[PDB]
Each structure stands twice: as C-alpha cells, then as structure tokens.
Amino acid sequence: GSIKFWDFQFATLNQSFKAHDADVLCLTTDTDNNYVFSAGVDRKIFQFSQNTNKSQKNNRWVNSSNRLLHGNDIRAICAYQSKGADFLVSGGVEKTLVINSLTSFSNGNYRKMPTVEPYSKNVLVNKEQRLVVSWSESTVKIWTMGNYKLVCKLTLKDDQNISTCSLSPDGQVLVVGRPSTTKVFHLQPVGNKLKVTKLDNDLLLRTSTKLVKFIDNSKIVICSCEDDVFIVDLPQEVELLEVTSTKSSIKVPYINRINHLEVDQNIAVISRGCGVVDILDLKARISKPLARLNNFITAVHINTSRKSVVVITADNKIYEFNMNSVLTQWSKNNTDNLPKEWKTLKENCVGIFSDIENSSRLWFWGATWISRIDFDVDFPINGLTITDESNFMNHFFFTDKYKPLLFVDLISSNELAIIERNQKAFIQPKLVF
Amino acid sequence: STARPRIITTTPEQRYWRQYTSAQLVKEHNSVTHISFNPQHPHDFAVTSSTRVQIFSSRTRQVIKTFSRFKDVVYSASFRSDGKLLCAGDATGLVSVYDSYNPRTILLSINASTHPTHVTKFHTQDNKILATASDDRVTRLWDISNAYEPQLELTGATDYVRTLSFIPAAPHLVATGSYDGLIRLYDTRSSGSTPIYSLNHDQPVENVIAVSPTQIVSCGGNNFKVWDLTSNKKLYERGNFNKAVTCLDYVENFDSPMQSALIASSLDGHVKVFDPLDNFQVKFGWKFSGPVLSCAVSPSTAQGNRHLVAGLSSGLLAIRTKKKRMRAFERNINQFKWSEALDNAFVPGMAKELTLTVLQELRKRGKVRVALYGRDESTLEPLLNWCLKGIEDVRSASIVADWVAVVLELYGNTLESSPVLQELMIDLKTKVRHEIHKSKEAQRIEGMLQLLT
Amino acid sequence: VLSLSFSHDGSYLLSGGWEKVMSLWQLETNSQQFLPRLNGIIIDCQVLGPQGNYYSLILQMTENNSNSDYQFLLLNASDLTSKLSINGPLPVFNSTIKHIQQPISAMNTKNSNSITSLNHSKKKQSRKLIKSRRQDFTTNVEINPINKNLYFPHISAVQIFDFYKNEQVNYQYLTSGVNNSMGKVRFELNLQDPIITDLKFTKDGQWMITYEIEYPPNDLLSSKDLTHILKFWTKNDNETNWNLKTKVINPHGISVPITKILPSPRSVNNSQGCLTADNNGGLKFWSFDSHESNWCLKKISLPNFNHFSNSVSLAWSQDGSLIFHGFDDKLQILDFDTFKKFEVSEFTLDSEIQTVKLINDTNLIVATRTTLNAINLLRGQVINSFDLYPFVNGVYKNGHMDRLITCDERTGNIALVINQQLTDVPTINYKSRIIIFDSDLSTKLGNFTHHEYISWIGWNYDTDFIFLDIESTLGVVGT
Amino acid sequence: KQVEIAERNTELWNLIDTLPTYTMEYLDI
Amino acid sequence: APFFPNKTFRKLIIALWSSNMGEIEDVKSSGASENLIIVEFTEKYYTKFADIQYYFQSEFNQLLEDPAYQDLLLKNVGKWLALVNHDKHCSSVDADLEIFVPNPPQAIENESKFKSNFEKNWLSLLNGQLSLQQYKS
Amino acid sequence: KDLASATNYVEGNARVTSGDNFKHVTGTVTVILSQALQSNDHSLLETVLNNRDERVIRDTIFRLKPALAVILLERLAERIARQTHRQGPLNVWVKWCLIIHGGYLVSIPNLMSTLSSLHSTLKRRSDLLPRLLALDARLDCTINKFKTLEDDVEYNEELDDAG
RNA sequence: UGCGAAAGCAGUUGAAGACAAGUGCUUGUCGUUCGUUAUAAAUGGCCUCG
C-alpha cells in the first residue's frame, strides 16, 4: 500500500507515502506530471500533487486527497488531457467505467457508466409464439411467456462467443452467427418444449457474420466480416456503394465498415460508422445513397407505413428520411425541437421498434430510459466529455422508471417486454452514530 | 494522558471452610473406627481400620507407616502429647504401645482385660499414665512403668464404656460416658472407683469431648449437649442431626475468622461445623456417601496445609485439605468495533456473565442501534438464541428486553421475508408469556406473605 | 476541530477538538501522531519555544455545563509529558452563570451548541438570568477533617484542592461510565455520565460515603429508570487515592433517590456509622462491621408514605441518643435505640423544612422555606423567629439551604443571603450578605457584605468558616 | 373482572407507545 | 421400516381389562387374577419378549391418564398383579428377552423410559382400591 | 504516573450488595422431605424437589410438621436465589406451604427476618413485570402484523454430433 | 418552559429583515433583528516506551 518516488539518475528513494491499505495495482499521471494518481485494491483513488511552485522547486510530492468511487477492485486507471478533454477513467471488478477530471479530481463531478449498454442486442423476442431468446458465451436460452417457462436451451461447441442470433418470424428457424462460422438450427415445438435440429448448409458454416436478418421465414441477409452483403434462401450478392477514403478512415479502419443492417419488407438499409446511410433493394440488389451524417449512427429503423427511415446519431438527434424532400416534414420541424428529456439524456438511444396499434407511433429506448413519439404531431416550439470543437471525422411518452434495460420490444399490440438485469467487497466502514 | 480503565466484569466463616476444595477419597478394608492427628509437626494423622493402623503424611496425603502386628480388630490410634508414642486397642483386650514411625518395636504391651478394649487415650497433662476403657465396664488407668497392675481402676458403669475424656486444666478429673446414658466424672487424686457425680444424657453416649476447661460437650444419640461442671447442667443442646451422632472433634485458636470450630459426625453422612462463641450454632456442613463414624481436623498449630478427615462405615476415607492479558471483546470495544464486539458476545463456550457485561458496556456506551445496523437473519440468530435463554434469568431480563426491541424496531421488513426469524419470535412469544406467567404468581404470593405479617 | 496551529518551520500542524486528543500532523508525509486522553477538549494549542521545546494547550472539561472549566497544560515536546498543569477550583453549580456558553459542536447537545443554537442560547441565558426567579447557583462542597483539603464533587469525579496552597492536589474518578475511556463525539455527547449528588466524610475522616445517580441512555425501553448507587471508600493518611471498599446498588429499593446523608457522631460506633434518608421518609442506619470488614445495614425504618418531597433535613445529637428528621412540613424526634418516634415528638411547621440543625445540644435551629426558628429542646418552645420570605421564596430549590446555612459546634452559626442588585429591572451582578448568629439567635455577632454570589458556605473545623463565590473564589470569615 | 380490565389497559397503553423475478404491471400513456 | 402397532395393541389392552368373569378375577388366596386369557397373555407373550413389555407400560400409562378408562384400570388390580408378579422383566439383568416384531423401533431400548413408565403405573394403582389380600401380595 | 492524569476508577475486590439485604438487621415423599430439611442434605432434598406433580406437592406439605415448614420456606428462597430459572416450579411449593400452614405462620414472633429472602426474591420478579408487558406489547404488534402478512430441456451439440 | 416526585400536572414552538434556488410568484436558509416562561451523514475513532 506504499507509493514511492525514486530519483532516476541516482536510483534512490526520494519520498515514501503509506496511502493505501492494500495492494496498489495501477498508477497514472497527467500530461505535465503535476499529478500522480494511484488506485488499487482498497477501492480508493489517491491524488498526489506537485503543482505548487515551491513543491516544484523542492521536488516534493504531496498526497492532496483521496476519493471512494468504486465498490470493488480498481484494476485499471488511465488519463487523457487535451485542450477540450480532461478524463481520468478507472475500471475494475465493479464492471463499470468511472470518469473524472484530472484538474478537478478533488472537487469535480463524476459519472458512473452503466454496467451494460446494449449497443448490440444479446436478447431478442418473437411476437409469434411468444419466445424470448438470449445468447451469452456460446449458450442460447429461449423462454416462452403465456408465467414464463424456459422451453429450451442450446449449447454450442465453438469457443468463440456468439456475435448475433436471428430468429425467423415464424420462429421455426433460428440462425446463430459467429465470426468464424454461421450455424442455422430449426426449432420445432413438442410437449411445451422445442426440438432442435441443425440444418446443414456449407456456405453459412464457412461464412463470417457480423449481422444477420430474416427477409421472411426462408430468406436471410448476411453481412460478412469483409462487408459483403448477400442473400441466402436456406449467395446472391448485393451491390454496395464505394466509400471515399479519408484520413480518419485510414487512422481508424472500422468506421467505414457496416454497423447496422436492417431489412424491412424487401427493403434493406446499411449504416456505417462514418455516417453514410444507403437504401438497398434486395430484389433489385442495387444500392442508392440516402444520407451522409456527421455523427456516429446509433440506431436505424424503417417504417413502411410512412415510407421513411429513422436514423439516430450519437448526439441523440432524430432524422426521418423519405425513401425515393429528402427529409420528412416532421424531421424538418422537430429534429432541433426535441423535448428537454431527449436532449438532456447523456445515454444514447440503441433500440427502435414500431407500435402495432398505430404505425405512426414509434418506440425508442436506451440502457435506462424508454420513450415513445408520434410522428404525426409536431412538438411545441416555445463536463465529462469532449467539447467537440473539432469535427467528428477529420403523443410523447417518456419513462426512466425501468432500468437497467437489456432489451425492450412488444409481444402484442398491448403487451410490452422489458428485460432488466437483476463478488465480495473490501470493507470500508461507514461511520454511523 | 492516562491508562485505560479495564472493563469491569455467604458468610466469612462459610468462605473459610469452602477453601478445603481438594477432595481425595480412599478405600480401606473395613470400617474406619477412630481417627487421630499427631500433635507435633508434620501432624500426621492415624486411622484405625480392620486389623491395622495407617499413618498418613499430611503433605503427601498418603500412608507412610502401616501397623499390621495387631491381630484382631483395632479400636484406637491415639498419640501422646509429644506424639513420640501412640496407643491402640484390640478386640482381644490387649493394649499395645508403639513408637510412632517405628512399627517394629512393641515398647509396652498390657493385657487390660479379657473383654475388648475400645478406647485407649494418653493423659494429656501427664505422660506416664495411660487410660484404658474396656467392655468389662471398668476404665483402668495404667502407667508406663507399672505394666502389671493399673494405677487405678475406675468402676461404676453398668454398660459398655466407649468414651474417655481428660479435662484440660484438671488433670485429676476424668470423664467417662457409657451406653447407660450416664456420663461419670472421677477424681484421680481421691481413692477413685466411684464417680464424683453422674450426668444423664438419656441416650447411649458415643463420644465425650472437653471443649474447654469448664465446658464439656457430649454427643450421644441424635443430639449433642454441652455441660458445664461448675453448674453441673447442660447449657445448650442442638439436635439438627437425624442419625445418632458418633464422633466429635474441636479445634481452637486457628487462623480462621472464627476463633474456634466444633465438628460433629452424624452417622447420616453429615459432618457439621458449630461455633462455640454463638451458642454452638450450625455454620457449615458436608455430605458423604454413607454414615460417618469418625471426623477429625488438623490441630491448631498445623504449620502447613490444613486437613479435614471423615471416616465412613464402608471403609472410605475422605480428605478435604485447605492448602496454605485482555480479551477479544475488550479489544473490539477499545477499537470502537461495535458490531464485532457484539459478535464476540455470542460465541460458543462463552460465560453468560461475561456476555452480559459486553452487552451492558455497549448499552452504557450508547452503542446499541449501531451494533445492529449491519446485520441480517444469518448473523442475527445468535443474539436471538441468547435472548431466548437470557429472558429466563432475572438479571438479564431487563437487558434482553432492551436489545430485542431495537432489533425489532430496526428489522421489521426483514422479519417478513425471513421465516426462520419469525419462529424465533414465536418461541420468544411463548417464553416471555411464561415469564409473565411466572411473575404473575410472584405478586400473588408476595401479597399472601403480607397477610400473615 | 477547535484548535489549529502551525509549527515554527511549518512542517508540522497541531490539531485539537472534541475528540480529547491532540494530533501532530506530519505534513511531509501526512502521517499523524496522537497524544490522546487529555482531561478536556482542546480550546487552543500552540508551539511555545525558540526550538519548539514545549506545547501549550487549553482544556475545557465540558462535562460541567454550569461553568467553563479551563485547564492550562504545558507539555514537554520531547516526551509529551505534563511539564506543568494549572487550574483553579472547579465547582459544579446547579445552573449556568453570567455569560457561560457551551463550545460550538457539529450538533446541538446538552454539552454543546450548534451553529444556530449559539445566539438563541445566549439570548435565552440572559433572559433567564433577568426574568426567571429560580437562581440557585449553589454548589456542594466538602471539607476533610484530617487534612482540611477541599473536595469538589465534579460530575462523575472528585477534585481534591488545597486552599492553603491554592493548588490542586488530586482529581479522582469515582464512578463508571464513559468518563475518560474516549472523547465523546456527535450523538455520544448526548450521553450523561453518573452524577455524584451527595459527598460526605465520616467524623473520623478515614471513610468516604458517596451517592451517585446513573442516567440510562435515551431511546431505550429502560431509558427512564435511573439507578441510585452508594459507595464506601477508604485510604490511609499517607495514601492520597481513595480505594473503594463497598458498593450498594439501588439502596432503599429501586428508583428511590438518596436525598439526604448524615455521618454519625463520635459517640455512636466511634464515627463509623451513617444515616441515609429518602423523599419517602424512610431512614436507614448503616455501620461498618469489623467481622465482615464491610458496611452493613444495622437499622431500617421504611414507613411507606405515598407523598413525595425532596425537602428533608436530618440532624443527630452529639451524644447520639436521638435523631431529628424533618420531612416535608413535619419534624420527628426518633430514638436511636428503638430507631422510632420518641415516647412532643411531632413538630408541625408552617411550611417545608429545608434545614434542621442543632447549634448545641440544648437548641435546635430549623429553617423552613418562609422563616427560621430557634427552639429549646429543654422547654420545647421557640426562642426567636426570623422571616426569610422576602429573600427566600422560590429563588432556590429545596435542600440548598442546607449548604447555604452553616454552623460551628462551639461559637454559633451563620446565615447567608444573596440578593439581586437592580437600578431603574434585575441585573446580572449580585450582592451577598453573611450574618453571624449566636446560639438561640439572640444577637448578631457580625454582618458582612460581599460583592458577588457566594455559592456555598461551610464551617471549617477551625473556628473560621470558608465560603465559595461564583468567581471560583474561596474566602474565609473568622476571628 | 378488574384484573382483565387492567391487563387489557396495559396492552393498549404500551401499544400506543410503539424484488420479484417476474412482475406484471400496466404502463400509463 | 421399524413399526409397532400401538393402536391395535391398545385395542387388545382395552379388551383384556374389560373382561370380567367374577370370583376368579379376585382370587381370595392372593388377591390376583387367575384369568386364563391374561395368564396365557402374561406367560406366553408378556414375559418372554421385551418390546411389548416396553410398549405395554407406555399405553397403560396413556389409558391411565385417560379418564374414560382410568376407573376400569383402577378397579381390577388383580389383573395387574398377576401380570407383573414375575422376575422376567425386560429391565431385569437376569432375564433374556426376545423381540416380537422383526423390526423393533429404537424406543424399546430406552430402559429409563420403561422404568419411568413402570413406576407411574404402580403409583396410580397403589392409589387405587386395594384389597386386603392384594395389599399383602 | 503523570500528575496531570486523573486517577481511573477501579472496583477491585469490593463487595457489591443491594438495599434489600436484610441479613444483619400414597406417592408422597414427606418423610424424605422432613428428613432432608432436618439434616440439611442438599442431595436428598433435591430429589424431593424434582417432583412436578401438583397433587404430590399438596399431599406432601399437607402432612409436613408445621415447624419444619418454616425452614422449608427459607431454603426454597435460597435455591430460587441461586437459580432463577427454577422460579416457576418452586413458587408452587411456596404456595401450598403458605395456605396449609398459614395458621401456624400467623403464630410466629417474626416473619420478615426469617423470610426476608423470599420477600427480596419475590420482589425482584415483580420489578420485571412492568417492563416485560411493554416488551410483550411491542412483541405483540409485530407478529400480529406479520402473521396477517435444466438438463431435461438441454440440447448438447457434441452429443448430437456423436449420436 | 413553569411546578413538582422520579410519576406526572399545565403551557409553548410568533413576527420582521436579508440571502440562495426554482419558475413579479413559490420553496429553503440565516457567526440579522424584535417578541413569548419557552435526524445526521466530506470514508472521517484514541501514540510509543519489553
């Protein structure tokens, strides 16, 4: 639990601080080496300061303060500083990220990230047959709700974890996808239980799959890890527009890769990290550009009834694009006029699903919030993140009662599924008198 | 600065006698009839059993000399005042004198009579004269020099004479008690053979002891009575005994808070201590397996560990001899570890009294709710288990009520989801209801007691 | 934190507060050393020396809420040992005096004031001293026959103070409780340690009788059952610390206070007996038995009266034959041998007796809340009667006239009266008058005036009388 | 009869001194 | 599993003591009952085997605490005397007692329970209406 | 010791005591009961006290010699005092003694001195009663309120491939 | 807060000013005043000399 400062040239001890009550696992420092931050087993983060000029002249460090922000081991800590950014990020056995400001660590506010942010959904629900399917660590479990019964569970050989699972609308066909291979299994109900048979298709087995979706009970769309979109009937490749190379793309490759694949009534849309959205006609197998946004896309949805595509950027702005005005009149009126709740959200939206009773109404939810908006009504006009001075590259219902949320979707027109998440700790007594 | 105050967790005569804790039980081959203590250091005591006399070391508490030359049953082992001699009686009537610690030599052998000689006692004041009592009902007074004829032959007893006592400060006076129920006093200065006067006990006399120069205590039948020769009448009489009192011994000027003690065998398994200063009143007693025939204590000048000896008809010999860091919870409380200190209170094999103190300390400390905040059903049961038993005790009754309420006020909602804790309350309900029920009579009874007074 | 002070170089920081612990903060490493266990919370702290050889500390002793008890400690910095401890007399008055305010704490308690509580408490204290009429400010004090040392029953403790040398000789803790085990903090400060109510010596002086009240903690089922304790203590003349010899828990029963205690005279049991009297009129005579080596209840009289009154006074004749027991308005003459009423034994008075005393065997002086009266036991009639109502109506609680009224056993007795001086509404400053009265109160030997409230007056075993003033000042009136 | 009246009174006096795995709920819109 | 038919056995109990055939029940010579059914029960069944002797004194206790049968058991004391006037007690060291049921419950082995049961039954009967000849026996 | 330091409180070997300490101010076992009381045999009497049958208690004390009754009352107080958990059974003995020999107990010069232990003992139980009722009421309300208030479906890919 | 016993018997907890927050209005506060007898909560626990 002791932190020691050593003179490099003479290889000798200069200062010793018995700060922590247990092992000190990791250390980090600011850009100017004015602050030394320690963290470790005792769940405490200690800041050591040499900022004062007299301290600098005398080369003496001072343990200014300490803070208790983690309920368990702080296995890792890192620091970043820039003209617009000041982040002290720590993580460990608590499974959550905690963010602080180096200059204002003692006095500044802090944010505790949710343990699970479902940017990629690990649970799906089938409206027909009322099945809820979750896949974790090469194990798939399926539940039926009339009240819930685990009808079946599937165990897979491959050490590789399951990337995605897609279930056919009928529910008879379940596709399990991994980067190494793709396997499809037919589900058949016998005696309130599902019988599993593995339909054999060589092409999928040798096919890498990031995203997979069902056109119908038979046909699927698969995007390979090399960004190859094709149709398999249970390969019909689909032409894709080329993306111009950018210095940001060179530095970070995956931004030009496909992030969200959504198919709806023979209409497919692809969103890349660079903000490029393209509408794909599966029958024609041709690509037409739709939009080019400046922010990362977090969620996409297609509404056939309104003949529009809903795109959500990282800044929680909502855009409704006409499929061929490029943007719907609602989007032109309401994108910058969103309610206070949407703008105030510090967690980005990740899931969109339609309302059966009214096609105009859409449902939106994040890790800790659920919202519904009607696109037929216009709204009344009336610190711990980058300031974003630089560019990224180069009728209304809101509820926060339910949290944390793994997956949200409807079972029926009037039935909503909300899926929620339900180790020893170093004893730091809280004095009570 | 100051050192830390350490956490603070009958009659005097009774307490003195309680110190004879060490108890050793020995078995002899026949009934142990007579027990004697050597007047001289190491004050080794002699026991008469079967055909042998055994001398026990006071410190070792073990036989050191075994006297087996006696042929028939042995009836006495009395020492002289010096202790260099010891005399004994035999069923054949022959009385033998041996050198103490030298079994082999028969120094003086006298045939008192054809009948058994049960009592042989050296005269305390005068060494040379040895008194012998026999079933012939004549208590001959023999001399060491004259082994062929008694110096005097006291008569007048119409029944067995089994008790002989010499009165201190009155060497000439000799006291004899027969199974007639008559205690006869004789003067050796006179011609003798006729009692000066007779004292009636009305019951066969088993032993007569001169407690003091003017007071003589006679234990016969179911009672013992103290007689004063100046008044020639019994001053006091105690009959608490139920069997017939057999043997009686007296010690004075010993280091106890009581100046003098009187120990009396009952033959009902009880030997009890009586104090002469308070009219010979019962102050202490002990129980044994069977009838007590002999009792003795170390003389006043023991100069070492005191000894209490009891003789039983079964041959059993009982010897009772009077020989002449901070705990975990204290650390928790000093270190302000409130919850842990409570945990230390309820641990297996922990004294109940100490358990009360730590609970009292925490309550006195103003740390009650704090000690219970971080608890669940798993760690709450040990307190409740103690509370279930502590409620019976009067001293803990107030304390348990205090603790039970706070946990109850503090863990309501927890009790709902925990079935195990509920049953603990249910049995807790029943016992307190009984404790109510027990108390309810107590107010009835106490008022009842008031009526009579 | 009440006291902060930098070291001369600035490498060390001294801190002190309610914890009763002085902390040396080593600033190069933020280490800390502790000198805990100090008598009072640290009002002030300083480094006093060219080289920091000594520390000067100020202690408060907050337990006494009536008065602010300052103690100045000079510690040798080398070994942190008391180089010099300084304090005056430490009386505990019944109520607060002048402008004494409790020190600031995190929350408002009995022994502390919150941030907001200070102004309201100050205003309330001033208006209590002005408008309210109960102004007892009386302290119990005791005097040692063998040593003539002055004993102050501090809360849970006794101060032995030598007025001849005007220096403290000892401070002894005579009760259990959280008294020096730690420094009470936050809600712990609401706790009340056992309070020594009555302290007396035997006439021989080798024995100490003490009466204590233990207050249960609050927020408990047994939070209203006060415990009453009696303790007998001894020491040799050479020895300076009393050793506890016997302890009686709940004398006279449960929840019954020991309102009065009287040591026995020399004639009876050569000064090793005592009498204890309740508000229920029950009397218990204790004596020390050599055989037990302990203190045992020789006699008892428990008339189960249903009326409760704290106004009782007890006197014992010098010969020891008889005892005078004044309970509420009625006085009884009880014969010691039978320990019961004499076979007029009953004297009815106008009002409750505060003090009953006999200046000499012939005459008995009885003070009631409205007057004082001198009676001859020989003829059983009042000699003189003096009206105390204009001065003593409700200024004092019952029982304080005992410690305000004092008597010699040779020359006579003294009456002390304290009055408020006010010019144009009452003012905080007071004036005291002491009057010397002969036996039968026929004449006034002398009348003297003091400029301040004389908290207590008693008769030293020499002809002189000693009087304690709320300025913590001990004066003497004598030939 | 006065016993039980008094005992009854005592009890009254002292008296006056003194997450599911699955949940079904209906949201409001 | 170990089992003993207490209820059926208790039914056998109520029948025997309810049986009454006049003078032979109280024989003038000894005051005991020469009842051939009881005598056969005593010799062939009661004395030989331990388990009934244990379960015997248990049920007769329970009936003795039942007021319905207390009067019946307290009257025909000769029947009790004829039963128990033997040295073949299961608590007797000399007697070697067999077991009726192949799988006796472990309760039978409890000698203290039997003696406590045995002591209770005698004491209640000794408080009963004893005949002059019964008194000598 | 530092002279500034205050002397600590130590009880040492002092004797604690209470203000109530007034010491210095067929089937019957009667014959055994009279026997042990006379001879102060703790072992013998404890066996007699082991009877829990009320009818025995009455009959035994019914025939007990009235003088021996008084000493029996004194002794029960002592045995109660050492062990309070035996309070319940032993009040019964004190009760039946009191009613049967009450006439004798009236004709006694002094009772409190010879029965002080009972009075002190009985008083202690009474002092508990007010508090326990408070405990019962609090203990009443809470219970009152609270009394009112995979392998079968497993599908293993390896075994399926195997067969 | 007054009185009294410890049990209890009666009676109180108002007004003004200033500041902050939210939206002129609302709420909360006071090292501000006048008048009446009149929860807490900055991870923060006690030295060494055998």
Side-chain angles (χ1 to χ4, degrees), chain F residues 11-24:
Chain F
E11 287 189 342
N13 290 318
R15 301 206 193 167
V16 67
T17 178
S18 176
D20 63 358
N21 189 358
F22 313 150
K23 314 172 141 153
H24 282 187

PDB file of all heavy atoms in Angstrom, chain F residues 11-24:
ATOM      1  N   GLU F  11     -12.876  -0.993  40.720  1.00  0.00           N
ATOM      2  CA  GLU F  11     -13.673  -1.574  41.796  1.00  0.00           C
ATOM      3  C   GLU F  11     -12.830  -2.489  42.675  1.00  0.00           C
ATOM      4  O   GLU F  11     -13.068  -2.587  43.884  1.00  0.00           O
ATOM      5  CB  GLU F  11     -14.864  -2.331  41.209  1.00  0.00           C
ATOM      6  CG  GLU F  11     -15.953  -1.423  40.656  1.00  0.00           C
ATOM      7  CD  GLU F  11     -17.213  -2.178  40.281  1.00  0.00           C
ATOM      8  OE1 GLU F  11     -17.144  -3.414  40.121  1.00  0.00           O
ATOM      9  OE2 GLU F  11     -18.276  -1.536  40.147  1.00  0.00           O
ATOM     10  N   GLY F  12     -11.847  -3.164  42.092  1.00  0.00           N
ATOM     11  CA  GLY F  12     -11.003  -4.047  42.880  1.00  0.00           C
ATOM     12  C   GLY F  12     -11.801  -5.187  43.479  1.00  0.00           C
ATOM     13  O   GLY F  12     -12.616  -5.828  42.807  1.00  0.00           O
ATOM     14  N   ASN F  13     -11.574  -5.442  44.767  1.00  0.00           N
ATOM     15  CA  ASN F  13     -12.167  -6.570  45.470  1.00  0.00           C
ATOM     16  C   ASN F  13     -13.392  -6.173  46.286  1.00  0.00           C
ATOM     17  O   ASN F  13     -13.770  -6.894  47.217  1.00  0.00           O
ATOM     18  CB  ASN F  13     -11.124  -7.223  46.377  1.00  0.00           C
ATOM     19  CG  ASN F  13     -10.044  -7.945  45.597  1.00  0.00           C
ATOM     20  OD1 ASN F  13     -10.326  -8.626  44.611  1.00  0.00           O
ATOM     21  ND2 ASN F  13      -8.798  -7.795  46.031  1.00  0.00           N
ATOM     22  N   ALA F  14     -14.018  -5.048  45.961  1.00  0.00           N
ATOM     23  CA  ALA F  14     -15.139  -4.566  46.755  1.00  0.00           C
ATOM     24  C   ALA F  14     -16.328  -5.511  46.656  1.00  0.00           C
ATOM     25  O   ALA F  14     -16.529  -6.184  45.643  1.00  0.00           O
ATOM     26  CB  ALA F  14     -15.548  -3.172  46.297  1.00  0.00           C
ATOM     27  N   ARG F  15     -17.124  -5.548  47.722  1.00  0.00           N
ATOM     28  CA  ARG F  15     -18.298  -6.408  47.794  1.00  0.00           C
ATOM     29  C   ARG F  15     -19.532  -5.620  47.375  1.00  0.00           C
ATOM     30  O   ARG F  15     -19.864  -4.602  47.992  1.00  0.00           O
ATOM     31  CB  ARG F  15     -18.473  -6.953  49.209  1.00  0.00           C
ATOM     32  CG  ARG F  15     -17.294  -7.766  49.709  1.00  0.00           C
ATOM     33  CD  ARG F  15     -17.726  -8.772  50.760  1.00  0.00           C
ATOM     34  NE  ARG F  15     -16.584  -9.345  51.465  1.00  0.00           N
ATOM     35  CZ  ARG F  15     -16.665 -10.047  52.587  1.00  0.00           C
ATOM     36  NH1 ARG F  15     -17.828 -10.294  53.169  1.00  0.00           N
ATOM     37  NH2 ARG F  15     -15.549 -10.516  53.140  1.00  0.00           N
ATOM     38  N   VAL F  16     -20.209  -6.089  46.334  1.00  0.00           N
ATOM     39  CA  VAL F  16     -21.460  -5.476  45.903  1.00  0.00           C
ATOM     40  C   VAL F  16     -22.602  -6.030  46.744  1.00  0.00           C
ATOM     41  O   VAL F  16     -22.563  -7.171  47.215  1.00  0.00           O
ATOM     42  CB  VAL F  16     -21.705  -5.713  44.399  1.00  0.00           C
ATOM     43  CG1 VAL F  16     -21.950  -7.190  44.108  1.00  0.00           C
ATOM     44  CG2 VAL F  16     -22.872  -4.865  43.912  1.00  0.00           C
ATOM     45  N   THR F  17     -23.632  -5.211  46.939  1.00  0.00           N
ATOM     46  CA  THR F  17     -24.786  -5.610  47.732  1.00  0.00           C
ATOM     47  C   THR F  17     -25.969  -4.738  47.340  1.00  0.00           C
ATOM     48  O   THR F  17     -25.821  -3.733  46.642  1.00  0.00           O
ATOM     49  CB  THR F  17     -24.499  -5.507  49.235  1.00  0.00           C
ATOM     50  OG1 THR F  17     -25.676  -5.857  49.974  1.00  0.00           O
ATOM     51  CG2 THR F  17     -24.068  -4.097  49.618  1.00  0.00           C
ATOM     52  N   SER F  18     -27.149  -5.136  47.806  1.00  0.00           N
ATOM     53  CA  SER F  18     -28.398  -4.463  47.489  1.00  0.00           C
ATOM     54  C   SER F  18     -29.085  -3.994  48.763  1.00  0.00           C
ATOM     55  O   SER F  18     -28.869  -4.537  49.851  1.00  0.00           O
ATOM     56  CB  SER F  18     -29.340  -5.382  46.705  1.00  0.00           C
ATOM     57  OG  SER F  18     -30.584  -4.748  46.469  1.00  0.00           O
ATOM     58  N   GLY F  19     -29.931  -2.974  48.612  1.00  0.00           N
ATOM     59  CA  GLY F  19     -30.621  -2.400  49.753  1.00  0.00           C
ATOM     60  C   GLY F  19     -31.602  -3.345  50.413  1.00  0.00           C
ATOM     61  O   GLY F  19     -31.970  -3.133  51.572  1.00  0.00           O
ATOM     62  N   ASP F  20     -32.036  -4.384  49.704  1.00  0.00           N
ATOM     63  CA  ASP F  20     -32.947  -5.378  50.257  1.00  0.00           C
ATOM     64  C   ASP F  20     -32.239  -6.436  51.095  1.00  0.00           C
ATOM     65  O   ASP F  20     -32.851  -7.459  51.419  1.00  0.00           O
ATOM     66  CB  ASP F  20     -33.724  -6.053  49.123  1.00  0.00           C
ATOM     67  CG  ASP F  20     -32.825  -6.816  48.165  1.00  0.00           C
ATOM     68  OD1 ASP F  20     -31.590  -6.794  48.351  1.00  0.00           O
ATOM     69  OD2 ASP F  20     -33.356  -7.437  47.220  1.00  0.00           O
ATOM     70  N   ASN F  21     -30.974  -6.217  51.451  1.00  0.00           N
ATOM     71  CA  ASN F  21     -30.127  -7.247  52.047  1.00  0.00           C
ATOM     72  C   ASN F  21     -30.322  -7.239  53.565  1.00  0.00           C
ATOM     73  O   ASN F  21     -29.520  -6.697  54.329  1.00  0.00           O
ATOM     74  CB  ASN F  21     -28.677  -7.003  51.651  1.00  0.00           C
ATOM     75  CG  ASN F  21     -27.764  -8.135  52.045  1.00  0.00           C
ATOM     76  OD1 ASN F  21     -28.199  -9.106  52.647  1.00  0.00           O
ATOM     77  ND2 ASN F  21     -26.491  -8.023  51.691  1.00  0.00           N
ATOM     78  N   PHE F  22     -31.415  -7.864  54.005  1.00  0.00           N
ATOM     79  CA  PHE F  22     -31.803  -7.867  55.419  1.00  0.00           C
ATOM     80  C   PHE F  22     -31.322  -9.137  56.125  1.00  0.00           C
ATOM     81  O   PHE F  22     -32.115  -9.954  56.591  1.00  0.00           O
ATOM     82  CB  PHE F  22     -33.315  -7.726  55.563  1.00  0.00           C
ATOM     83  CG  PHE F  22     -33.926  -6.645  54.718  1.00  0.00           C
ATOM     84  CD1 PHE F  22     -35.229  -6.774  54.269  1.00  0.00           C
ATOM     85  CD2 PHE F  22     -33.217  -5.505  54.380  1.00  0.00           C
ATOM     86  CE1 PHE F  22     -35.811  -5.794  53.495  1.00  0.00           C
ATOM     87  CE2 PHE F  22     -33.794  -4.522  53.607  1.00  0.00           C
ATOM     88  CZ  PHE F  22     -35.094  -4.666  53.164  1.00  0.00           C
ATOM     89  N   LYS F  23     -30.002  -9.296  56.207  1.00  0.00           N
ATOM     90  CA  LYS F  23     -29.431 -10.419  56.943  1.00  0.00           C
ATOM     91  C   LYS F  23     -28.913 -10.020  58.321  1.00  0.00           C
ATOM     92  O   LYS F  23     -28.924 -10.846  59.239  1.00  0.00           O
ATOM     93  CB  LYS F  23     -28.308 -11.080  56.136  1.00  0.00           C
ATOM     94  CG  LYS F  23     -28.647 -11.332  54.671  1.00  0.00           C
ATOM     95  CD  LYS F  23     -27.431 -11.815  53.881  1.00  0.00           C
ATOM     96  CE  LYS F  23     -27.803 -12.892  52.867  1.00  0.00           C
ATOM     97  NZ  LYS F  23     -26.872 -12.917  51.702  1.00  0.00           N
ATOM     98  N   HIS F  24     -28.461  -8.777  58.490  1.00  0.00           N
ATOM     99  CA  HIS F  24     -27.902  -8.330  59.760  1.00  0.00           C
ATOM    100  C   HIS F  24     -28.837  -7.432  60.559  1.00  0.00           C
ATOM    101  O   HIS F  24     -28.497  -7.066  61.688  1.00  0.00           O
ATOM    102  CB  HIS F  24     -26.583  -7.591  59.523  1.00  0.00           C
ATOM    103  CG  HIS F  24     -25.427  -8.500  59.254  1.00  0.00           C
ATOM    104  ND1 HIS F  24     -24.131  -8.044  59.149  1.00  0.00           N
ATOM    105  CD2 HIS F  24     -25.371  -9.840  59.066  1.00  0.00           C
ATOM    106  CE1 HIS F  24     -23.326  -9.064  58.911  1.00  0.00           C
ATOM    107  NE2 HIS F  24     -24.054 -10.165  58.855  1.00  0.00           N
TER     108      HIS F  24
END
